[PDB]
Amino acid sequence: EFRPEMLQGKKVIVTGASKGIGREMAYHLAKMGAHVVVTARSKETLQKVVSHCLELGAASAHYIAGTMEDMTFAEQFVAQAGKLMGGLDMLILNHITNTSLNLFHDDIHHVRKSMEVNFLSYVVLTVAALPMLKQSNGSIVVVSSLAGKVAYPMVAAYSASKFALDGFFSSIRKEYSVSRVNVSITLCVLGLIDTETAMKAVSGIVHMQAAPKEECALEIIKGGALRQEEVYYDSSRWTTLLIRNPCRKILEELYSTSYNMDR
Amino acid sequence: MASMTGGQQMGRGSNEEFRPEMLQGKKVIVTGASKGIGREMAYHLAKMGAHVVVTARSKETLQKVVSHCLELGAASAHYIAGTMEDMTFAEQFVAQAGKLMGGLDMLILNHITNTSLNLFHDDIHHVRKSMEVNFLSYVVLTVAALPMLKQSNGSIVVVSSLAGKVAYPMVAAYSASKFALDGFFSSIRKEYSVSRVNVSITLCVLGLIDTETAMKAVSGIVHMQAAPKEECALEIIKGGALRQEEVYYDSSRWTTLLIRNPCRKILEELYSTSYNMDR
Numbered sequence A: 001e002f003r004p005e006m007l008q009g010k011k012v013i014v015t016g017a018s019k020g021i022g023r024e025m026a027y028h029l030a031k032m033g034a035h036v037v038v039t040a041r042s043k044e045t046l047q048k049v050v051s052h053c054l055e056l057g058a059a060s061a062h063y064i065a066g067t068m069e070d071m072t073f074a075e076q077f078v079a080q081a082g083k084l085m086g087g088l089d090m091l092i093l094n095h096i097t098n099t100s101l102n103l104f105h106d107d108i109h110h111v112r113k114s115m116e117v118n119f120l121s122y123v124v125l126t127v128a129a130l131p132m133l134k135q136s137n138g139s140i141v142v143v144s145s146l147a148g149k150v151a152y153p154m155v156a157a158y159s160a161s162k163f164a165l166d167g168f169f170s171s172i173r174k175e176y177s178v179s180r181v182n183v184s185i186t187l188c189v190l191g192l193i194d195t196e197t198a199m200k201a202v203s204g205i206v207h208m209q210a211a212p213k214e215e216c217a218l219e220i221i222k223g224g225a226l227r228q229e230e231v232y233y234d235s236s237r238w239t240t241l242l243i244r245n246p247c248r249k250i251l252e253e254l255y256s257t258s259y260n261m262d263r
Numbered sequence B: 001m002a003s004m005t006g007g008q009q010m011g012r013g014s015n016e017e018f019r020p021e022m023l024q025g026k027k028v029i030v031t032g033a034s035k036g037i038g039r040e041m042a043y044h045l046a047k048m049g050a051h052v053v054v055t056a057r058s059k060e061t062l063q064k065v066v067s068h069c070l071e072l073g074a075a076s077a078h079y080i081a082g083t084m085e086d087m088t089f090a091e092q093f094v095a096q097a098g099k100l101m102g103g104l105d106m107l108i109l110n111h112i113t114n115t116s117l118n119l120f121h122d123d124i125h126h127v128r129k130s131m132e133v134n135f136l137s138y139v140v141l142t143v144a145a146l147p148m149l150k151q152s153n154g155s156i157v158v159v160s161s162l163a164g165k166v167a168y169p170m171v172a173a174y175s176a177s178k179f180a181l182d183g184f185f186s187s188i189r190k191e192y193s194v195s196r197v198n199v200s201i202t203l204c205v206l207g208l209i210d211t212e213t214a215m216k217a218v219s220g221i222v223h224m225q226a227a228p229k230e231e232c233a234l235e236i237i238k239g240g241a242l243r244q245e246e247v248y249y250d251s252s253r254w255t256t257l258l259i260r261n262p263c264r265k266i267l268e269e270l271y272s273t274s275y276n277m278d279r
């Protein structure tokens, strides 16, 4: 059972924190009295989030503006965020490249950019953050979608990148377990959320109930704090009932006796 | 006689029971067909009397596969050597292959970058290369092949792994790329359905296979029973011919029982009604 005091004085990074779910997470963490370093490209919007974080009661609040298309920025950002806070307890990976609901035709540039920003930068951020997270027995929080677990039309490139996060981070979770790296990994599987971006994107195309961004942001933080492997958040009782894959976990365990990693 | 001949091999029960004659005279591309499962698929297709265009980097190894395909009874057999790290090669290969056969019925996406079983530390170059070769090139080959496949009401065959459905340690990069194939190709399958593009997509979920590469990779690290490459290759072709959405092939009779996700399919079918794609 979660308590807001679990985040009191914790050193947290939040990516894609200038708006939407990312901004809501920064605000929640501020209220809990955490140290926060927020990122996104817009320096001006990050300034207002930092200012409001300090008002809400953050132990400290900083921003570092830049693009996650730049893997050098991604790497340097973590070192700089760690130096400002004097360490790192939680890494919240939330940013995505701009997308829309459209049929896929021939836009390989959007497929590549989606893999680079939505996936490869998450791997770069993890590599850069792991020494500090190993020191604190910290947490990695990976923001995904229902579209990163089941198939949906009109989001092929996006779905690929979210599926890749599951493949990558679920594999290293098993590796951390055997190599006794006490860094938890939480994959957050979210349904439709009432962010400005999502509401504009689904308008007249998707007829679904949207869940509130404030509660969504809190459920992500809760999962991270509780070191839960996965978080499932959706407005529908039918979605939450069916989204889980109990057989996958059973399968992985039956195959867990087939390895020797003493090398 | 060919000008005086006509008809269809795909009638009653052809959606369920496979016959080697379903591939007779079919125009098939096989990527990563110089060795392993890919080579076995080329050999099976040759025996079925299909037209084949095989690819890999090694011109010398592709020459031997082509020669043996012609011996086995392929209607035609050609090779185009190159690297799938080059997206210009991937695009141009499909056009050149289509010209050699006078069209395309089946696109078999099987190649992968060289990988090993290792714990992930900091090799971002291997994560990028895995995404580029195992995933992005598959998308480039699909884009280049789709006009010909639409013309023939063809098939796309995507070779994946159990590691592209469940998590395994020591294959983080590899698994990331195989999971991405599922996300990408399962989404466009739903798109093809609404936009009435009659091109089937088969995702093949394979367990450990007795290929030289896999046997060397797992040596002293992974102790699992390996399935035969010859039978594996045939099951992939069968799934493609039958237009099955997924193929599950593993040594364990139990894996086949658990690997399927009925909940995913139901969730997708319930969310299908929530759209408006009249735009």
Ligand SMILES: NC(=O)c1ccc[n+]([C@@H]2O[C@H](COP(=O)([O-])OP(=O)(O)OC[C@H]3O[C@@H](n4cnc5c(N)ncnc54)[C@H](OP(=O)(O)O)[C@@H]3O)[C@@H](O)[C@H]2O)c1
Residues within 6 Å of the ligand: A015, A016, A017, A018, A019, A020, A021, A022, A039, A040, A041, A042, A045, A066, A067, A068, A069, A093, A094, A095, A096, A097, A098, A117, A143, A144, A145, A146, A190, A191, A192, A193, A194, A195, A196, A197, A198
């Ligand atoms: N909202 C939903 O319905 C929904 C559903 C499922 C999953 N999710 C997941 O929830 C997360 C947040 O979504 P959201 O709706 O809150 O999105 P959002 O409001 O559009 O915010 C996206 C954030 O990413 C940043 N960003 C965009 N391009 C970037 C780049 N190249 N480099 C660095 N940062 C970049 C944006 O800031 P700048 O443009 O200033 O950089 C912004 O802060 C995502 O991971 C998404 O997959 C959302």
Ligand SMILES: NC(=O)c1ccc[n+]([C@@H]2O[C@H](COP(=O)([O-])OP(=O)(O)OC[C@H]3O[C@@H](n4cnc5c(N)ncnc54)[C@H](OP(=O)(O)O)[C@@H]3O)[C@@H](O)[C@H]2O)c1
Residues within 6 Å of the ligand: B031, B032, B033, B034, B035, B036, B037, B038, B055, B056, B057, B058, B061, B082, B083, B084, B085, B109, B110, B111, B112, B113, B114, B133, B159, B160, B161, B162, B206, B207, B208, B209, B210, B211, B212, B213, B214
């Ligand atoms: N074997 C298993 O245990 C296993 C298990 C599950 C799934 N699978 C899947 O089965 C498929 C085939 O695996 P396999 O074990 O049969 O592989 P394999 O015998 O090692 O063959 C890989 C093929 O890809 C080619 N290739 C390598 N790098 C390439 C590049 N840069 N550009 C173009 N072609 C390239 C190789 O030829 P060149 O080196 O001459 O280029 C070769 O023909 C893969 O998709 C694999 O993930 C295999």
Ligand SMILES: Clc1ccc(C2(c3nnc4c(C5CC5)cccn34)CC2)cc1
Residues within 6 Å of the ligand: A099, A101, A145, A146, A147, A152, A153, A154, A155, A190, A191, A192, A193, A197, A198, A199, A201, A202, A206
């Ligand atoms: Cl057709 C369809 C596609 C995707 C979705 C869902 C979804 N996942 N990410 C998003 C975004 C991201 C912020 C961009 C915007 C809108 C919906 N999203 C799972 C809820 C619902 C329906």
Ligand SMILES: Clc1ccc(C2(c3nnc4c(C5CC5)cccn34)CC2)cc1
Residues within 6 Å of the ligand: A259, B115, B117, B161, B162, B163, B168, B169, B170, B171, B206, B207, B208, B209, B213, B214, B217, B218, B222
């Ligand atoms: Cl630990 C572990 C990781 C992966 C696997 C499986 C697997 N998938 N692709 C491969 C390869 C490809 C030629 C590289 C080599 C060896 C095993 N592979 C599912 C059987 C089993 C155990």
